[PDB]
């Protein structure tokens, strides 16, 4: 959605606002709710075989 | 070539501004080679494939090289050594904090525009006799004499005996070019000369980048009493012209049309725009006085229109 | 004052209670390693994932 | 996603009597009339006030105002060039702050309407402000500003 | 007054230009006139903080003032003189009027409240949900000049209420039974919120089914 | 347990290292003295390693080398009684409920939501701990 509406100057179809949580929800999902998460969905699955 | 391998680094304006584009071009000369050496290393270990005239004959299975990481944890070390020094150089003159600044601009950015005071003007060849006002800058200490209860609290104030709502670190000017969400603000300066910015924000963190000074800084709400050194200095600008200039931090929602201009003009078209400001005038009235277009040209006060899809 | 809305609160819970898990699950990774361990794997043969 | 691209805060009109005339570069605000009636209409011959506030939108200006005149004959006492990346306000709306409490320019450009025609709250009248720039049909509202009630007889059962 | 026009205009320039601009026409789409709102207006909005709003939204919360009372009546003396109208009430000294704006008549509030207010907020004072991401704020928080001044002026989705309609004595009647309404213990034990069916059901289906269900446990036998 | 506690030895050293010389740097060639956030955090967090490397050593010291801290240990040497583990249990995903729900009363600031996800974690804790220990029902 970030990027279909920072394909072309204008406001789209995004809001300045719904862009603004877009990079907000976006960069916490992506770090806190995919990428720290899943260090421990790593380790629990081969820490204990390893 | 030097445009091209500055990865789209604008050409400096100012003597910090081009220092710090030799810095950045010598340390991406020094990364680019960096990576051309370790992606060449990668793209050659890929021609060690699995020979299929690979006998039941394992690899050399050494692991284990002292000596070669200790090379390449000291020439790491080395350069890295050598990029903090240039750092540390061109750092030094990042606020020389010159105490005889030729032009001092109170840039003061609230929620989605900027103001630009003016605050005091003493050009080194000798003119411009102009000072900041300061009779605005009014407390709001909430000293009250008793609060709710009947005696004993006499409450001073939350923070430091004032309340939040103080405002008084933010200083005003005679001279504002404050900027409307329908007219880009345009702040004007002298060619040449010395020009200080004193930074502040009325209400929330944001950040004053001009693209082509080739800095930015925070312009934070309180930054004496958060120990930030918002005031900065730059030695000149060589070039004149309109030169856009961009809010680099999150302000909220229009965080970004807070979009503004830095336009340099002549020490003359300076000395005319102040004088003609003295006068009742406001900044595109001035301009066009001084023979400069009056409207940002560098950029648009585009539409308050929420979108495009939107019904009007 | 700025962003008053209930979206940037539950944001700031969802960190919290999120974040309890990742220290909760530190302290799993680590007791395990520390104290659960093959008993022929030192500390310093065991693999470097772990 | 209430708070796209058409957000109810956003789209809201002032919560004032005055209607908002954007057409041409000069936008008018809050424009009403203060007409005190007393009964059904307010009688023809009678003058009635035309509130507004004429704000200048681009500071390259559009302030001359020349007649902005309709059935009802508006004539604009003190008229003055004030709009430039600016206000211009014709009178004083009920509550309004004598900012100045001296004659500048004798009065602020009050703008004044023989009826010639019956006129009563709750209608919507059309005005033709016109500027140099263009002209403008606006529907002016009557608007009782800051007037209390008036004390409505007492009524005898029957 | 000269200087809290000139402070008005002062905190108007660094906090508000880039949604009413200088001249406090609306800014298209960002913001409405502020011609005509009125100091009442600005007082309501600014003192309870809901205005300085950083969003376009459903409806524009309610949040900490921006501005203190000093600040707040030089902001709401600049639009006054701007646009000129409605005034926020004061008593003798000059401070905002509070106290004075408690109304004798309590039943008359009340029935007041019921047929205007209660009509989107409450029975009691409590909020209530509009149309679509919008709600009536709890009354509990606002003080007396701040209920005022919401009946005078419509701030979003609130009918405006002008004086000829509910004339100062009637906006006092209703201030001071939703005050009273607000600062009343509940009769009877905890008052669970303000609303009856739906917290009532919840605590009972917790609290009493719980109970019951737990001695049940301990009573009986598991098999 | 002598690599385990060395570790977090080693790391108190250096982050007592790191704290006193920002005090130092930061009481002097600071805007305005001391930072006090970034000294505080790097102080407290020697104080975690200093306090697990602590209690790692005790334990270093009070034990024998066992079979997983020996090199050239077989594993029959360890094979033995390991110790009890949870099996299946439903009690987690609960406390997990009754915290989200404290959570949502924090962020939507609903004090009546709190105490009941306050009661709620208290009893779901209060079920995960006793899980093991409940015992028979006595009729
Ligand atoms: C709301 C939160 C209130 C705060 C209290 C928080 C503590 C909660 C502890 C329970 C968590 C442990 C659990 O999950 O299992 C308990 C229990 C038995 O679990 P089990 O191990 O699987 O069954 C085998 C037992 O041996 C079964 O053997 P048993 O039946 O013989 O065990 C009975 C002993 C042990 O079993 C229990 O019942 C323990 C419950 C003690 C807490 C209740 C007293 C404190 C709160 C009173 C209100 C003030 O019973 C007692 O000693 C007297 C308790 C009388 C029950 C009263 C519960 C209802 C009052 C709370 C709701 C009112 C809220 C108003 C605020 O099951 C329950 O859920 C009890 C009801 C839960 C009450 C909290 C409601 C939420
Ligand atoms: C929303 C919040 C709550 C709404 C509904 C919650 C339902 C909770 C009921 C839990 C009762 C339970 O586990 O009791 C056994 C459990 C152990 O006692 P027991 O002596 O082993 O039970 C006798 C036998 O074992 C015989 O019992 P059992 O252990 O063989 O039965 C296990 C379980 C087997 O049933 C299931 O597996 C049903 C699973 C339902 C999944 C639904 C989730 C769908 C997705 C979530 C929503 C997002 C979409 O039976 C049920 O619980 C059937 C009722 C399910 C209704 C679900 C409504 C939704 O009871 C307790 O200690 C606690 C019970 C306290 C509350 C129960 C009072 C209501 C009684 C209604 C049914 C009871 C029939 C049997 C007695
Ligand atoms: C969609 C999927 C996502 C769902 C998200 C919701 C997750 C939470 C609901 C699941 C929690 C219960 C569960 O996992 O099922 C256990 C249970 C099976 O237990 P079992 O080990 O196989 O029992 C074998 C024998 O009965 C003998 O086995 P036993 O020795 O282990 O004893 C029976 C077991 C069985 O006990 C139970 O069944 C208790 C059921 C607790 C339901 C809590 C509802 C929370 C609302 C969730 C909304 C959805 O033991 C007990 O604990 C009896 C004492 C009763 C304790 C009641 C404690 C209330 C805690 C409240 C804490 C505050 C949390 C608020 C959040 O499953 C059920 O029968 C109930 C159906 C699921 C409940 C649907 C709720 C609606
Ligand atoms: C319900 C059932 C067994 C049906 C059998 C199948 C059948 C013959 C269906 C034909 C009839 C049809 C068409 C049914 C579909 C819809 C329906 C049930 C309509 C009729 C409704 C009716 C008259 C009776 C249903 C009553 C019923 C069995 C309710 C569930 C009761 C149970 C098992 C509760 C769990 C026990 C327990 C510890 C409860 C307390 C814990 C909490 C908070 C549970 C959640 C909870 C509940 C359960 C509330 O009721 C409630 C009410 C108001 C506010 C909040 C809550 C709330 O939070
Ligand atoms: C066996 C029965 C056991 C029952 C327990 C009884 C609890 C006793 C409570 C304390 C004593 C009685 C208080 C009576 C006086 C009183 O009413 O208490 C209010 C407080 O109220 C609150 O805030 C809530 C505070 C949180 C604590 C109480 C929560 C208990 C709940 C959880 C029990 C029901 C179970 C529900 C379970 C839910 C979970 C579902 C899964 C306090 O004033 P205030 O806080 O200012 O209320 C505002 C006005 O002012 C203002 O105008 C008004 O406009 C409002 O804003 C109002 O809030
Ligand atoms: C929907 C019709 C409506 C009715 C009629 C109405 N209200 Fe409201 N009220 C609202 C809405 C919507 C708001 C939100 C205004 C805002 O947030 O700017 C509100 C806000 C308020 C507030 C602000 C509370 C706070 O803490 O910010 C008060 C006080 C209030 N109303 C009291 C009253 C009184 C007194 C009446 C007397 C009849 C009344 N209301 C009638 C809907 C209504
Ligand atoms: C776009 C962000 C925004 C900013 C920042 C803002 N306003 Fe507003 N203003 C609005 C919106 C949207 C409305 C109508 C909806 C609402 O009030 O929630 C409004 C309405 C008002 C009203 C009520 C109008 C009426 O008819 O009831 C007043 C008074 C007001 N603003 C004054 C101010 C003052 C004073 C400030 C500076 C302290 C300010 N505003 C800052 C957008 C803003
Ligand atoms: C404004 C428009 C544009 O955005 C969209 O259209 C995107 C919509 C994505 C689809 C969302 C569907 C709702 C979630 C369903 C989850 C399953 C529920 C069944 C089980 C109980 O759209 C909108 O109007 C709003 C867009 C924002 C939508 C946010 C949805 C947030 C989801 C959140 C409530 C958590 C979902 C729980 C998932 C549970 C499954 C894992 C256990
Ligand atoms: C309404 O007011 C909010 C609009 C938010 C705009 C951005 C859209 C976000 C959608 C992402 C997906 C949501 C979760 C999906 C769960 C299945
Ligand atoms: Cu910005
Ligand atoms: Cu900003």
Redesign the pocket.
């Given at each position: 959605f970030m990027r279909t509406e920072l394909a072309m100057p204008g406001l789209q179809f995004l809001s300045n606002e719904q862009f603004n949580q877009l990079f907000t929800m976006h960069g916490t999902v992506m770090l806190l709710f995919y990428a720290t998460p899943i260090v421990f969905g790593f380790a629990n699955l081969v820490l204990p075989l390893q | 070539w030097s445009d091209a391998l500055a990865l789209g680094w604008p050409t400096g304006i100012t003597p910090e501004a081009k220092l710090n584009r030799e810095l950045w071009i010598g340390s991406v000369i020094a990364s680019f080679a960096v990576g051309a050496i370790v992606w060449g290393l990668i793209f050659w270990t890929s021609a060690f494939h699995r020979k299929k005239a690979t006998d039941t004959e394992l690899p050399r299975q050494f692991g284990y090289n002292m000596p070669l990481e200790l090379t390449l944890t000291v020439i790491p070390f080395l350069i890295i050594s050598v990029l903090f020094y240039f750092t540390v150089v061109v750092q030094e003159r990042m606020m020389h904090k010159d105490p005889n600044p030729e032009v001092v601009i109170d840039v003061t950015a609230f929620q989605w525009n900027w103001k630009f005071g003016y605050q005091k003007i003493a050009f080194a060849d000798g003119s411009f006799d102009y000072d900041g006002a300061d009779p605005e800058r009014k407390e709001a200490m909430t000293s009250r004499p008793e609060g709710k209860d009947e005696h004993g609290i006499e409450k001073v104030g939350p923070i430091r005996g004032m309340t939040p709502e103080d405002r008084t670190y933010l200083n005003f000017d005679k001279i504002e070019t404050l900027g409307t969400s329908s007219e880009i603000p345009v702040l004007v300066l002298p060619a040449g000369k010395r020009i200080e910015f004193v930074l502040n924000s009325a209400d929330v963190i944001h950040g004053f980048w001009v693209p082509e000074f080739l800095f930015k800084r925070d312009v934070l709400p309180e930054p004496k009493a958060n120990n930030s050194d918002n005031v900065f200095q730059v030695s000149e600008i060589q070039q004149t012209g309109a030169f856009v200039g961009r809010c680099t931090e999150m302000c909220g929602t229009f965080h970004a049309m807070m979009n503004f201009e830095v336009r340099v003009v002549e020490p003359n078209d300076f000395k005319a725009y102040i004088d003609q400001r003295n006068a009742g005038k406001t900044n595109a009235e001035a301009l066009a006085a001084i023979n400069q277009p009056p409207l940002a040209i560098t950029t648009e006060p585009f539409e308050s229109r929420r979108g495009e899809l939107v019904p009007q | 004052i700025h962003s008053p809305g209930a979206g940037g609160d539950l944001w700031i819970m969802g960190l919290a209670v999120g974040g309890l898990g990742t220290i909760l699950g530190g302290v799993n990774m680590i007791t395990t390693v520390v104290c659960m361990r093959a008993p022929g794997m030192t500390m310093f043969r065991m693999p470097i994932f772990t | 996603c209430s708070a796209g691209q058409i957000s109810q805060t956003t789209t809201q009109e002032p919560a004032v009597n005055g209607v908002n005339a954007q057409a041409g570069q000069v936008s008018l605000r809050n424009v009403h009339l203060r007409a005190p009636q007393q009964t059904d209409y307010v009688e023809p011959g009678t003058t009635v006030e035309l509130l507004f506030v004429a704000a200048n939108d681009s500071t390259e200006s559009n302030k001359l105002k020349s007649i902005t005149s309709d059935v009802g004959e508006v004539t604009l006492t003190g008229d003055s060039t004030v709009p430039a990346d600016g206000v211009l306000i014709v009178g004083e709306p009920d509550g309004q702050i004598q900012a100045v409490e001296n004659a500048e320019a004798a009065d602020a450009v009050t703008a004044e309407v023989e009826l010639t025609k019956p006129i009563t709250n709750g209608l919507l009248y059309d005005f033709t402000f016109t500027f140099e720039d263009g002209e403008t049909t606006v529907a002016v509202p009557i608007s009782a500003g800051e007037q209390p009630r008036r004390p409505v007889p007492p009524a005898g059962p029957g | 007054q000269s200087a809290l026009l000139r402070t008005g205009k002062q905190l108007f320039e660094t906090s508000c230009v880039s949604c009413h601009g200088a001249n406090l026409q609306g800014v298209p789409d960002r913001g409405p006139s502020l011609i005509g709102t009125g100091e009442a207006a600005v007082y309501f909005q600014v003192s309870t903080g809901r205005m300085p709003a950083m969003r376009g939204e459903a409806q524009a919360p309610s949040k900490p003032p921006h501005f203190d009372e000093s600040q707040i009546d030089a902001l709401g003396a600049y639009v006054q003189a701007n646009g000129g109208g409605p005034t926020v009430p004061r008593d003798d000294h000059g401070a905002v009027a509070q106290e004075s704006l408690i109304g004798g008549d309590v039943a008359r509030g009340g029935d007041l409240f019921r047929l205007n207010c209660a009509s989107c907020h409450n029975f009691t004072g409590k909020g209530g949900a509009l149309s679509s991401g919008k709600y009536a704020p709890d009354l509990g928080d606002a003080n007396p000049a701040q209920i005022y001044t919401a009946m005078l002026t419509g701030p979003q989705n609130m009918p405006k209420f002008s004086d000829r309609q509910l004339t100062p004595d009637e906006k006092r009647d209703i201030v001071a039974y939703v005050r009273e309404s607000a600062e009343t213990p509940s009769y009877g034990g905890y008052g669970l919120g303000g609303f009856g069916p739906a917290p009532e059901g919840m605590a009972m289906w917790i609290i009493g089914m719980v109970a019951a269900?737990?001695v049940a446990?301990w009573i009986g036998?598991?098999? | 347990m002598h690599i385990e506690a060395r570790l977090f030895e080693i790391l108190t050293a250096f982050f007592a290292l790191a704290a006193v010389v920002y005090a130092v740097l930061t009481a002097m060639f600071a805007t305005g003295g001391v930072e006090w956030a970034g000294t505080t955090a790097l102080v407290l967090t020697t104080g975690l390693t200093l306090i697990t490397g602590t209690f790692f050593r005790f334990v270093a010291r009070r034990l024998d080398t066992r079979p997983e801290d020996y090199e050239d240990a077989e594993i029959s040497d360890g094979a033995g009684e390991l110790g009890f583990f949870a099996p299946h249990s439903w009690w987690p995903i609960l406390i997990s409920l009754s915290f989200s729900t404290a959570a949502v009363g924090a962020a939507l600031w609903l004090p009546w939501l709190i105490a009941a996800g306050v009661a709620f974690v208290i009893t779901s804790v209060c079920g995960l701990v006793f899980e093991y220990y409940w015992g028979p029902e006595k009729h």
């Open positions: - | - | - | - | 269900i737990g446990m036998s598991r098999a | -």
